């Protein structure tokens with residue numbers, strides 16, 4: 001729903017409530033707005049750029065106001081502060097998908113189906129309605145909440161934000177050199193699903209007995225070498241359904257052309273089956289995260 | 292600069308200018324209240340915060356015993372809402388990377404003076420303490436209006452390293468291949484650093500004859516920016532970069548080449564380099580580094 005309740009945001013209007021997370025050039029915090037008692041997450045990006053294009057970075061970030069979908073995280077506002085640029089966004093009380101993976105040892109297919117949908121649609125939104133790819137899809141960038149919503153976060157709307165800036169989710173074609181598009185995010189999403197499926201980052205593909213700690217039946221160049229030159233991870237053909245099996249196996253074909261695309265996936269039998277399934281995802285969330 | 296205050300309080304600091312950020316750190320121009328001394332403060336926003344964070348500062352303390360005209364000063368370090376703060380000597384000339392932006396490419400005689408301090412600073416940390424730099428690169432070679440060339444961001448604390456982006460790498464071929472960091476690794480980082488400052492750009496995609504003619508035309512012999520894997524896979528498997536012919540002295544040429552031998556065991560060590568005729572020549576030919584630094588940076592100050 002829409003934040004007409006507020007408007008222009010300055011620094012003072014905010015008050016720290018909690019600490020949400022930290023990343024590579026970014027601290028996020030639960031804060032409250034003065035004018036309207038809205039809990040919104042505040043993204044501090046500590047940076048150094050001339051008093052000239054910091055406006056240009058804010059200007060390019062303003063198209064986020066034009067980004068509205070129940071699968072794209074709500075964007076309240078962005079401004080320049082003495083030290084950092086803030087991005088205030090819809091507060092997702094379920095946090096990140098790896099956060100919830102940190103609690104729940106693995107994430108079940110039924111849920112992963114609901115995730116796949118929400119990402120596929122979210123991806124499609126930015127592509128259809130804004131002509132831009134989500135060049136950083138990963139579990140930490142899929143935000144959930146107690147309302148039962150799964151939403152995408154942290155996409156490169158701003159070209160000059162990108163320029164001014166243990167695991168890797170990047171696609172073969174993105175590492176190898178040229179030829180990179182919306183097929184890259186498919187790979188990203190694919191791996192991300194396989195992660196939450198098995199339980200850990202699956203690029204060293206778990207061995208014959210690795211996953212057995214769940215059921216009955218290292219270097220940075222070395223990593224990049226594996227992704228580029230070695231077979232992709234697969235879901236073990238036991239606990240997961242042939243259709244989920246096939247879904248991720250279609251997302252992790254190295255050749256981007258061979259790899260399935262948005263439409264092929266969105267009409268994949270796994271997605272369709274997931275689309276009509278009844279799952280208390282808001283319930284499963286609260287059963288684990290406790291809120 | 293052996294300025295003293297010296298027990299540092301968070302609220303004693305005042306944000307003046309932002310200095311930059313990268314690779315897990317945020318450098319800020321700050322002012323100290325009970326001394327009036329403009330220092331640099333680095334925000335390493337480190338996550339985990341138990342007795343390990345307590346070992347980090349305790350390990351960092353050896354930086355008080357770290358004194359050489361070739362190593363950046365250190366006022367102290369403290370815990371401040373998780374994110375640790377290393378407070379260091381403000382180098383008003385900025386990084387060598389900064390001088391490369393304002394200057395064209397750096398003249399090979401000035402690099403000689405730079406080359407002395409990297410080797411000497413490198414050797415100081417190596418011999419007096421037992422740590423190595425793990426991050427030699429233009430942005431980590433700091434200069435000043437007094438004419439000093441110094442070194443920072445070297446790994447004093449083991450814990451801080453184990454506690455913490457590939458736009459363009461300075462890592463040696465053999466390190467990328469997971470054999471642990473040596474002296475020779477810094478040496479490689481120095482070579483590439485030199486070739487960078489000599490030529491005016493990151494050399495790893497090497498300049499083709501045509502491009503070299505646009506740099507210092509036309510004495511010339513032996514577009515897009517490489518992707519992450521593409522880059523490293525180049526650094527490893529492809530031949531090392533070289534200084535162009537007929538522009539820099541044959542001695543400078545052999546110096547940097549000894550620095551950039553892919554085989555780390557065949558690479559020049561600190562002794563070879565310090566006794567190299569390029570470094571010998573560079574010592575006797577006293578050149579006004581302060582005059583050059585200040586005149587190309589419009590920074591002329593009384594030291």
Ligand SMILES: Fc1cc(I)ccc1Nc1c(-c2nnc(NCCN3CCOCC3)o2)ccc(F)c1F
Pocket residue numbers: 023024025026043061064072073074075087089136152153154155156157158159161162165456
């Ligand atoms: F916080 C947000 C909320 C929403 I809703 C949409 C975008 C963002 N943030 C970003 C971001 C962004 N948000 N978080 C990060 N973190 C850094 C991710 N990277 C890691 C390594 O290399 C490059 C980027 O980048 C980048 C570009 C851009 F145009 C944005 F709008």
Ligand SMILES: Fc1cc(I)ccc1Nc1c(-c2nnc(NCCN3CCOCC3)o2)ccc(F)c1F
Pocket residue numbers: 313314315316333351354362363364365377379425426442443444445446447448449451452455
């Ligand atoms: F800020 C400083 C000032 C001084 I004088 C000396 C060291 C540091 N900083 C560090 C640092 C440090 N300061 N900045 C970085 N950033 C680079 C991170 N990388 C480490 C290794 O390889 C690539 C990048 O690391 C690391 C370990 C350590 F023990 C330190 F004391």
Ligand SMILES: Nc1ncnc2c1ncn2[C@@H]1O[C@H](COP(=O)(O)OP(=O)(O)OP(=O)(O)O)[C@@H](O)[C@H]1O
Pocket residue numbers: 020021022023024025026027028041073089090091092093095096099140141143153154
């Ligand atoms: N709107 C939000 N609501 C709740 N939690 C959030 C929100 N945005 C981010 N977070 C949390 O804060 C953390 C930091 O996010 P940030 O994008 O700065 O880094 P990251 O996603 O962890 O990794 P990277 O630096 O690679 O992006 C995330 O892991 C996420 O759990």
Ligand SMILES: Nc1ncnc2c1ncn2[C@@H]1O[C@H](COP(=O)(O)OP(=O)(O)OP(=O)(O)O)[C@@H](O)[C@H]1O
Pocket residue numbers: 310311312313314315316317318331363379380381382383385386388389426430431433443444
């Ligand atoms: N003591 C200092 N005095 C003045 N400027 C400094 C000092 N230390 C760092 N800087 C500036 O801050 C900038 C960013 O420093 P920082 O070390 O965070 O990233 P970096 O220099 O790119 O190296 P790395 O990414 O490996 O940390 C540098 O370009 C340098 O100009």
Ligand SMILES: [Mg+2]
Pocket residue numbers: 023140141154
């Ligand atoms: Mg993120």
Ligand SMILES: [Mg+2]
Pocket residue numbers: 430431444
């Ligand atoms: Mg540095």
